[PDB]
Symmetry: D3
Subunit: 336 residues, 6 copies
């Protein structure tokens, strides 16, 4: 009934709801294209598995024979440009679709994040409705809490196998820790009269095509590469707080007045899901340092340190970058 | 010992600590210049009395004879430009000082807000030290709570008289109400694991040299003139929330897409004391509407309404404008 | 419900300087055409001069005195500033003011007469009907103002409502009346002196807009007209100097600003020519205004001249000379 | 006593009063350089003789021995760029000076228009003057009226001879007529309480690298090439004045609204001596029309090349006005 | 049959092949307009005769009856702005056309350089050609070698007569020499696997409204006025090449570092026929020096006015390069 | 504690293509001068070509094979990309890489020899000492690469360490060796054909940088050199076309982009000339790159050509031809 069927998701993990839709797709179209979103996002409690792992997981639920008509595509996130995303999807799809006009998109409008499901009017849209009782969020929560009965009856058996092997790895132990932390963090705000909103700053300091970075020291994202930034204090201005944090986390050897006078731009980042803590809006300041020897910063140990990274280094380690920091850098790179 | 002595304050109200310093000034200099800060700020729980009232209050504590060597100056706030403030102080002072170089500034470095006390190196600075037990904040709190024994023994007798007459007015009843509200508002956050930070948007919509305004409907600032704005919701972007609030408070008859496409600039306002609620940082969006008939907006009743105001109207009613909204408008007026 | 009139609202715009019998005829026509009438007092807060001698509360008192309290229940007075170089701004102000009364009604008519060039605004309200009344001969506020400052009572007493006559007879004893006569005479002599010129004269002046730290350098006028009004430093261009030279010369004469000419020269960020034909009552005066932005810090000393804040300018709007507030507005 | 000596002037005409300084020059320096100012300026009552003609005059007054240690250099006027002029001057100097550092400039500050003798600081300046009094203004005045007695005693015999021959000239008639018109024009303002001040607009209209020009229909500079321009009326804005004047003088086939919309810039030209009628300040508006057919319109479109070739025939300072909007 | 008729060409020289179209023109329209292209272009082996000279030639070939219904119009070249050219063409047309709408343009698209006959769309176009074959390239080739037999049978008797007289000319020697040099230069590249491609830099140095110029020391266009410029060496960047070339040809007294810092702009000039040596693309760098003394340096500073006056003596397309950075 | 060496750290930068006996002599000198030696492998991730035949892990394996494990405890290998038009970027990368080893020490010396124009970088580390070694005759990596691709073993076997000889003898049997010989021969013939030209030839090409929605239009190279590498669409300028025409012509030839020339013409936002003397191995090639920004939406179809994301370009850095990555970087 269609030559091509597209199913997009994160599949973190692939569950019985997803398989139902993936089965429906196999009925409605000859070739099936699975699009693995959030490609190369750093692993966190919302996206635990890398996209090759997610492909293996899905493949393990299907037969070699049905796999003959199944195509995997991975697509990065561009949290601040839907158009860069759309284009990448079109381009990845085209390479399979030849160019055909016989194409459906299967999905369910679950919530606010499902808005993309109608940015393909070019193609047809098959809404599936909700399938009770299959919730990725519930599955992940159960899994990090070690409650097997709340997830085993919700994933394909090949998925349960995978979750059980993966339960042995270092990543799982780190993700359990990070999950306990967030849960406690959110719980500590449970008696607020209103959902809280968090304000942070971030410093984007660039010298001779390099950006000053740190390894995160506090949860969440412990150990990931990040911009130097943090929570605004009650009595400081955004610039002040930005400078205070830059100094605390990098001990950059440049006097505060030249730092101030080197701020050439700033920009607010407010994607509602940028941070799992929390609604967290960050104010990023772009600082351009002049030519010369690379500026000195604390050489603490290695997990304690700060260092300078070129764009090449940045792309090379894309999946080690915290939250949307790669996007913040890319925004100011478009400015220069 | 000096030809001229400068004492700057808000004096809300003038208390025994202030009188001590004002007396010390009268010993140390021939002429005394009192500078009434926060001129033409809308009345709130932090600045209850207008600057002519504050002058009357101070005059009532002094004798006609000593008043012969006392000079009053009023100066506006410019929360985002210390330089505009400094200049205005210099200019107001010069008109009394003739131009003399014999000038001291008396004060006490109480807290972060006292930072201005050393932006006059031109002139000498006499630090007085703290005088125990004389706190404006404590005085105001006591007064709005009606607890006379906590303030009577802290102000000059002429000040106690004034507070007692003023306790009859409509302003006092409104300020009591507003004070109860804030107190309860802050108390409701008392069990937060961290001081909360608030995020709001504000829309600065301009057509044919007019700015769209509202009369505030919620406390605090009930009844004051304000920009249309409000709290960001958890799942909306800043622009989205800005547009949602503009529509809720003005029902402006301009379709959302043309509104979006008319945003020409935005700017963050983060003076830590802009709002008495709360650390509240607002994100203001400047929208330029094209020439033509003045856009329709809700004509509700009068306290329920929205309307268009020229800069002239704005200056004419400066002391009816909420928090720092006049400053936000002035920022974008410097852009055009 | 059957209306007794064609429209809900009638708008009658003017200076009314003073209200004369022509104006009352149109006002009466408006009372026949609309249930409620809106009088718009233009030139609100303009420095009293020979073209605009009465302030808006005086003009409202004058018109009120011609009308019975039953009619006054149907009349609403609104004031609106002039913004000589910005018609869009003015159009919006009129609209916003009218809306306080109108509640948004679309049943609205503007009454007037396209008298001369200054009446162009009558076709800028297409959202409302327009009712041309034709000319009433000859009622002329210019002629009436002339007769009044010249003391020729026979030429205006039969041109104005009896209540206006009374008000005029009373105002005639004020200090403002004397001040106005003095200024009227000066302008009359001034134009006199050019009467034998082969063409109408065109005057060239320069004005200096000097700004540092949100303050504009202003002076009090030492010569007529507008004697004692607040103004920008400026004056007439001499025959052998450039505009910039004239500008700086005149700035030094009037303020004695303690800044070297060479740094004043280098501090000129912009300039603009202001040429509204009626900006000055002395004759056609076209002015060259120069925006000078001083590097921040302590304000330079001057010798009456002073640094005035933007808030203070708005606060003393009505003491400002000619178009000078608009000149400042243009730059800051 | 000096290797090289420089004397700059308009010499309109060359008078005894120059000659004496010229003589004083030949004494103080071995080589003498005479710079003829105002090169290629349209002929008018301030500047009647072309620079070749002025060369001829100053030559006749010299015997060849002398004429053979004197070099003649012409310099254009750029009324609004002194730097450009100083440069053109010192570059033309080098042609002869070769690069010498033993140089003297002679003259004296007579008025305001003699300001050009503080710069140059790289050479030595010897002040003569005042020689009271020979006055070219007075001499051109005398010469144009007919008061022969007032100037024969004032200029060298050879000059007088050339002036004499020139009276027959086709130009002398038109230049006489111009002198009468200006003297009358100025006279008509004598009852004014203050010196009058004239305001004009000029339109600079440019399409496909051509500027719209006209021949002047009215005195002064009648028949010269000019920008469309005129006197502001009492009740029009500068913009509306510029536009009516443009339509009057050229009847340009472009709708008024499109013309308003095509204004990309404007500039005020205010040199005190730009107009001989008295102090006239002009407001120039630069209109820039989209590519394509040249619009219908003596008025005609003229290229930047055309203008340069005919710089001689351009009114007043209209060339500098054009140049200002072009670079 | 038509009121007005237009025929545009370089006519270098006027050949039988033109004449026939000219004849065909006189037949089809009552008035004939001949537009002499390439007006004021320095004389070179593609364009040997000035436009007055070309007028003279085409006149001799006509009897006055005929010569009296033919008008001659000159148009400059602006190699990089066709619009400017089209405009100058149709404006000069109107001088004669008065404003007529019965007009025809004659010729035919021979090659790439004949593209200019699609525009104009406002007139009627009648295609002649091809007339196989008379070839000016071949004729100028013959003429410059000495192969008389190759062109006498190709051009009108009067043309031949003028060419004959011209052989004696001071120019014909230098133009012959140029032809030999180019033919040799091109010949030296015959063993190349592909047509060669030349890269040069030019420096456009500008202070106080003057541009630095030089006389060409090397063939081609020897002795003409040019920008300081040269061939890129194998291991220098364009910037460093431009700068060494600038110092070589002018010995400009300004430190290299200041010169780097004063570069405000650069532009590539790439018209296929700009250089007669073969495909040469030049990279022009615009250096803008601060006001004051003109720096020490045949090289000399030259005003925009000077350049316009001497446009005749300017190499290749160097005038257009200057003009590009000025407006 | 008494040091046995002058410095704590010695830095030796090169391509080492291949490591020969000259390099080993300097390396040995560095081991005498510093306690720890840092070898910087330049040209990391550059597409293998006749100037850079071995990738950095191969070059590290090669140098490792010449050294005893006791010496290797003192040697540290670091890699660094080329950024042909940005020396500041490169200088910073070297500094940052060195700092991983140095801990910030100031006791640091760079050893090398100012051989030719490409050695300019040796004076751009003033924060460190420089030790000029002088020239060793004649060891030449160019000559050794020449002999090796030409199969003349006598000309290089005695120029290189025995371990390098072994590695060379082994690599010689790979498919990459054949590919390199093929390309070497092509370039050699190419230059051959120009040998009788009166001056060194200068080549002119155009390149098109077409971008829509964060994607650059790329091709796979159909002709040598760099056959099968990813590249921008471009080629040689024809004799009678303009650069823009050439650019568009060549863009159409190589990609068959379904966009009309007139809209391609109107979409050129910027252009830049790239002229590093060694950008291309064929001879001096100077290129004109044109930035074309297509209006957003669906990407236009093409016919091998494709739209490549900026992330994918970085991911496939090493498959890119000549300086093309730097050309893209310049614009986006
Ligand atoms: N600009 C951008 O970078 C951009 C924009 C939009 C989306 N994205 C990316 O695309 C991906 C979006 O995928 P997702 O997070 O919505 O995928 P998901 O894994 O949550 O769900 C995949 C699909 O299955 C459906 N589904 C899940 N549970 C269901 C249930 N129980 N019943 C019926 N249907 C159910 C979902 O609605 C969805 O259509 C993410 O990677 C996101 O980051 C990127």
């Amino acid at each position: 009934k269609y030559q091509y069927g597209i199913y997009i998701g994160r599949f973190q993990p692939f569950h019985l709801g997803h398989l139902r839709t993936l089965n429906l797709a196999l009925e409605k179209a000859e070739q099936v294209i699975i699009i693995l979103g959030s490609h190369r996002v750093a692993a966190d409690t919302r996206n635990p598995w890398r996209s090759p792992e997610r492909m293996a997981m899905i493949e393990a639920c299907l037969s070699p024979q049905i796999l003959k008509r199944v195509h995997f595509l991975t697509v990065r996130d561009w949290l601040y440009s839907d158009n860069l995303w759309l284009a990448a999807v079109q381009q990845q799809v085209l390479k399979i679709t030849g160019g055909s006009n016989s194409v459906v998109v299967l999905g369910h409008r679950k919530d606010a994040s499902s808005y993309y499901l109608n940015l393909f009017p070019q193609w047809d849209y098959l809404e599936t409705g909700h399938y009770p009782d299959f919730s990725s969020t519930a599955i992940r929560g159960a899994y990090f809490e070690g409650k097997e009965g709340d997830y085993l009856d919700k994933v394909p058996p090949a998925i349960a196998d995978y979750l059980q092997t993966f339960q042995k790895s270092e990543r799982y132990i780190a993700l359990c820790d990070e999950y306990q932390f967030l849960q406690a963090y959110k719980q500590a705000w449970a008696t607020a009269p209103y959902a809280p909103t968090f304000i942070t700053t971030d410093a984007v300091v660039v010298q001779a095509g390099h950006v000053l970075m740190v390894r995160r020291q506090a949860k969440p994202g412990l150990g990931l590469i990040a911009l130097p930034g943090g929570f605004i204090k009650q009595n400081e201005t955004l610039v002040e707080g930005m400078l205070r944090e830059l100094k605390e986390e990098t001990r950059l050897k440049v006097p505060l007045p030249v730092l101030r006078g080197s701020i050439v731009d700033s920009h607010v980042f407010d994607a509602p899901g940028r941070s799992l803590r929390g609604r967290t809006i960050t104010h990023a300041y772009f600082i351009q340092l002049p030519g010369g020897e690379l500026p000195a910063v604390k050489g603490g140990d290695d997990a304690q340190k700060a260092w300078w990274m070129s764009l090449a280094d940045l792309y090379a380690q894309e999946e080690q970058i915290y939250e949307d920091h790669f996007q913040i850098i890319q925004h100011f790179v478009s400015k220069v």
